[PDB]
Amino acid sequence: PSELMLTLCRCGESLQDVIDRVAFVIPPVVAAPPSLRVPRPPPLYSHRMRILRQGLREHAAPYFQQLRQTTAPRLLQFPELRLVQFDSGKLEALAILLQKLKSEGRRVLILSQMILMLDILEMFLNFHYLTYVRIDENASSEQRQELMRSFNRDRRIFCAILSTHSRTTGINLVEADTVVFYDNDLNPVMDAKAQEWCDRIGRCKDIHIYRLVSGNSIEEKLLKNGTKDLIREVAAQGNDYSMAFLTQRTIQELFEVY
Amino acid sequence: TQRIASHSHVKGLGLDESGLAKQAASGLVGQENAREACGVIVELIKSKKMAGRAVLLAGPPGTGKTALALAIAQELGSKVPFCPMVGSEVYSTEIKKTEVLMENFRRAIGLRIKETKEVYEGEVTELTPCETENKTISHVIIGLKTAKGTKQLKLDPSIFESLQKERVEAGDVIYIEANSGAVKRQGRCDTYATEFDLEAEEYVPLPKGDVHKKKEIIQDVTLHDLDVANARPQGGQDILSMMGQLMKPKKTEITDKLRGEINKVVNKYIDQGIAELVPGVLFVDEVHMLDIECFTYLHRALESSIAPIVIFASNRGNCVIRGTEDITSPHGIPLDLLDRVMIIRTMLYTPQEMKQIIKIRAQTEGINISEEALNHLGEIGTKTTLRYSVQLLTPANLLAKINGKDSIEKEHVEEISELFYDAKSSAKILADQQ
Amino acid sequence: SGAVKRQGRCDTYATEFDLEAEEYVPLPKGDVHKKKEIIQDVTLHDLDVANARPQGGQDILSMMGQLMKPKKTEITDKLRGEINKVVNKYIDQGIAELVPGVLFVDEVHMLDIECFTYLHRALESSIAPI
Amino acid sequence: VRLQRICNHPGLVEPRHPGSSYVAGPLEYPSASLILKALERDFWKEADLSMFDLIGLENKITRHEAELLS
């Protein structure tokens, strides 16, 4: 009369686990029922419909939540969260790096020049169940100092996310022995500010630094060859001094791949 | 990598800029007259002026009737609808045959609608009902928080019940679509991630956009989707609709009134600039399996002003029409329907064309083959049929791989032909050896 | 019986509200205790088919029977027998009169052999019509 | 700059969006009020055929109702 025949997905599991994994189809359209409109409904018809709907609602009240849960349609898909990691190889490498560092018991600082990339990193870290603290331009100096101290005092937080363009004064010490750079800006002043904070992170403990680079691309061209030293003048110079300051040889060297 | 199929080598009709057919292009070789005719039909379809024009591809088996129909689909591109069908599908248990035909007619008419979607998303700061007798909930007040701000909203009690649906509470992140009233609880905010060492909740970040957003998108639908969505309504909130949805769903014999109303509102969308119509193609392969009732219904359907372009295919001779029990007619089709149709004649292939197609299928399947084995396969194709000769390539390649060779030779083809027999040879065994 | 209905608000209340959703009704005339004899004519219309699927009701199953598809079902001979019994009882009590009528089957050649063979027994019945 | 944005994450340029259905709305079929007044009849010529309701199955049964009969 009863048995474990409901294990239709193999490897045990309740069948709702597999249903959630492969249920994605939505109607192309969906529409509400047609409405019968008359200028003046008769009294008896409306009375009957009122009685019928009141009775159905009142008598389905014990069943109601499960009822409308079973019946309701699926109208939204949303992207899967794993596609965040899959769409970027830097996040694919960062997953391995952060898993290794968490196995080592380490704590990290992750830095990027773009505020939006921090918004994506929040979703990545939630996908890997990692707690974090965020600092950016929109955070006030009071909020920034308080959140940095919250990261420093509390070991429950695995990592800290910072905008490279919102460093600001006030940070006296960091309770972390590892740093990851998601990107490097074209402005040499931010490179100088990065290299200085690689030093004033502190000699109280030995530290490591990581920098993610997209292979076979402009990031590898700028980093390994050091082509930024040719571009460096434009940040202070501005565009108006010379339209073609970057030579054709520089363009050929930079914008190329094997 | 995608799996190889019978017509995967076909990429188009291979016609030049002047409309004439190149001898070998886009996976097709020969059959130049039919390819030029199919190009004219492609020009007919892309003009979007005509309705109900019908075409029949007629010829012996194996001459490429299905390939040219699929070559039209490649030439049109994915933007135009192309609804393939086979005549056996009309015999449903749920609905009558003419309904199946009319449903497939409507599937081939596309519609690109600009839709404006109102969405609310944010962390639920608070959630308080407001109720009173006219006893019942007049509305629910909800607050939402995002990185760019916060806002207080009052919403319908249907959305309030759709919030109790997801077990939504303060601090949870949600996504509401006001057009349908659909609600999704994405999860709890990441601010509360550190509050426990272990908790069953799934955490998501705070939304970064505005609390209320107004977005414009373009939706690809057919007329059949609009018909079905209103025939069996699914997006309601009344109790009666929910009871009706508990019934087992089956296809119903949709009326002409509903289709007329859908045509009316589609015309209103087009006049308002909201929507664009994209009429397409219906492809009924093996129409000889349709019966006389189906053929007779197509007289009225093909004469409609809404109908798409239709492509038929048949290989029969002076065969008996199904359902008539003594009436022979060409192509297994009645004369009266055949009068309403332009016929494209498909021819048999020469040995050189067979060899060329075999080489194309070999390089499509990833197979190297010597010229001797290719000539032997061409001889086999002339002796038996093209399709039999093509099917020997993969087994011969497997035998060559088992032998350590990287290419087919004649001995492998000989061994495969000895192992696997064709229909004519097997029939000779049945008739002579018995 | 227990039947109650508001026919409507009285017509003298024309200035009670500036709008309405239900129309007013005038007073009735004659004595308040209205009373007269009536006659109604029926067949299976509300006897066999009425007792096949119970219309009305107040449980869940009757209510969601009210929105199921109406489908004809093959009524049992036993229900017809009980219907005949109660109708005979009420004829004996005198509040009902039996009026046999006529069935006209035009194009009778279109019936099947099974239909004719059933019509043998059907015409041999004592309750059958002309 | 655009290539660097692509190198970081493609969602910085072309984010994925949720798929969804095209909400069409109701058709609003109109008709007159007398159509709903069909099959209505009048009180002095209708209803109260409950004497033939064999399927009522009300409280208690014939084994006790026979005493009520006599």
Next chain:
Amino acid sequence: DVTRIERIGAHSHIRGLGLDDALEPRQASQGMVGQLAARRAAGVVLEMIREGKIAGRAVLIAGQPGTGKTAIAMGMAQALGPDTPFTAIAGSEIFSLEMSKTEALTQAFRRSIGVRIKEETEIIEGEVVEIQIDRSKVGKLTLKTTEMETIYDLGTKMIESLTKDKVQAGDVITIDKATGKISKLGRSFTRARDGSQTKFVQCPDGELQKRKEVVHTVSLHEIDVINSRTQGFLALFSGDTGEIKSEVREQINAKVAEWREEGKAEIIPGVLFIDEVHMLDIESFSFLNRALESDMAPVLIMATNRGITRIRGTSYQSPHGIPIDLLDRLLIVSTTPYSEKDTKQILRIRCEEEDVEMSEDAYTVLTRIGLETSLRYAIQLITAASLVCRKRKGTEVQVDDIKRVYSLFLDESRSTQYMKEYQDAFLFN
């Protein structure tokens, strides 16, 4: 131009019967050509229809294929207009798995009889620039109208209904005096100034309480389906009607007659058109024998070519594939084959509808081809020839384009010959 859902089809060019006031047909008028006797007979039948006194009349249109009987029926439909019902079906459509053949014909008959009802309403209108409504509830309807403002005292027991369905500042609404309903127009520019597809009207006009009569034409089938079930009107769209009980139909007939005699309704008889009636069977024709004897029956029109042909469901043969029991109960209209001049004029009309220019030599060649093979084949070559002309950047269709298309696309007469040349290659002869 933007593509509407209606596009050019087989019978789009005809827009009526080309008849003068004396029902005498013109040689070419309203898209129709020739068939003078049949067109005159159709005009007589049309005058019989629109008078509406005589019930259950049946007509058959017969002739060879391609002689325009379906075109005649479409012309009758266009000349009759939308104010009278015109139900069109094929004979194959009654073979439903949901219902019997007789039930399908029954509700096809009833879709062709309209019931016309006029209803009176009282309605108030005003612009929602602001609402000073509290919700018991209190309000004064602070709305605007061009003649004088829509301020108006409100009954306190129902003011929540005014605020129920999201009435918001920057809108225009209408209110019913007796029903109490409220409806909205949306983001009007005069009120919403400070959305797409909203009512872009200005501030409303009139003396607030405006009288309005509304006319509804409802078929008997709609009355049947609506009253058969609690939410039966959905079945009109889904087609989930079962076999409607006979008890419902006679009650509705009695009620409709009562409304007609009481003056509360008007009966509008229409037409049922069944193309290709030779798919019907003996059972269907036998039902049609007695269905046409009802006073509430429409005019019936039928089309079939045939000769002496087997009746479906039988081994018997009869003229037109119809039993003679039914042929006695109808009048037969005969369509003759077309001449050279009529064929040429039809091709001229079709080229005009398709927006195609051709040379006179091209017209001559296409008229030769039309008589040689078929009219519908020649009509098909117009579009293909225009497309071939367009690809070579031509302005008018020439004889060479038609010869090219004739070489590419071929008709049954040549396809059958080429098939017979490869008889063993083609299957199951």
Next chain:
Amino acid sequence: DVTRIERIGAHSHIRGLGLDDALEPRQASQGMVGQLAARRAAGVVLEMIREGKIAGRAVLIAGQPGTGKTAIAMGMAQALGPDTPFTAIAGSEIFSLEMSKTEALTQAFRRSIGVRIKEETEIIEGEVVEIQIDRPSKVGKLTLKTTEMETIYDLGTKMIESLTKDKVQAGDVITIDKATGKISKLGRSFTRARDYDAMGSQTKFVQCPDGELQKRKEVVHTVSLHEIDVINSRTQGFLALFSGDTGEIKSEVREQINAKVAEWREEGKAEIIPGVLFIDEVHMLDIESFSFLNRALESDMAPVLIMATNRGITRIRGTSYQSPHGIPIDLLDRLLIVSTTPYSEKDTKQILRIRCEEEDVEMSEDAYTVLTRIGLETSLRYAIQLITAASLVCRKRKGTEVQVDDIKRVYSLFLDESRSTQYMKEYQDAFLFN
């Protein structure tokens, strides 16, 4: 003793095809004997199935009755293994009242294609060292350990709910899904206290987990396309997987599912595992079914089709025509034919030897010779059936080996078709409706 549900069937002795690494068949191996060419061809087809590149290839096994067509099919099934699908049906099974023939064949086609879905999960797995719940809103604390490490967790409310509903207590070994907090209990490492009366189940013990308490692991789930169709066909449509109320799944659902599976394949989530559909006695199919198969085999998601039939020139069902194998030549051109020959004296003897081993029956050599001559004279299946009867007859006389007299005894008791027909012709007046 211990009779499991699988007992000795007709093809239980077959466990493979008995082929060399070079696909060359052995004279007797894996229960198969004889049919060298057919077994070699089946091995080539099995390699085609294993590589999985080519879609919709069709094979027919043909020959007289009793020649091992079905045996070759089960040999392919056993050699292929359980990881790849192998859907087997009879041709009569498609004639359903719930659905059309085309729908049934579509479901059968899609049952034979596997989707190997793969995803990452994080678990917490450890021996429960301590748990505390301060129920009065509830709060609590949990402690877990492995052989390597221990950790204390401050619990959230919903985790406490899950722990209480599962009645987790110390000494248990559990696995906690980090994504949703589902708990699964693996066993116990410590006994419950013996002071407690009546709760004294002995049970069995499980070792402590090793390594980290929290781990990330890959998990693979396999589902067919038909399962995805039925789940997405309607709300609560999963019940139709068992009940079979899958009536006429809409085509748009299947198109959406195919697109989603393809994009999953490109996005690294899933792998397509194309299997085999086997239709034994395919001559029961109607002309409409074969016409549908013509187009169904041209899809890229099509599996390998295998069919078995014995007919010669024979009527096609649903028609008055005749063709080889009772199959139209439209389909026979699309497939390769494998021919099985009748068995010789030695092959029959080896089959009977293998069958005696499966049934645990010992017979003398004279008995084997006599049964071989009987099988050559009447049929192989009759001689196989006599083995069990002869063994029972030997057993009831308390014998140890089946002798010639037992075989002759059962030959007298049980009749074959030829003798029964002869004796029926003697009583031809007594038998009914000749």
Next chain:
Amino acid sequence: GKISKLGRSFTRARDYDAMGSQTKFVQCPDGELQKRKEVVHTVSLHEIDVINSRTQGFLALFSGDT
């Protein structure tokens, strides 16, 4: 328990029936409350099958919808 309701007396009226006085009277009890009695139920086998086939399969006994 399974409590049930048979009738009522309306003690204000006495010795009236079938006219417009005391019309709602049904019966008065006539014996001691422990009314043990034997009752016999006649039923066909098919009715037992129909009653047992569904939760409320007895409705099919009227409609014939078995």
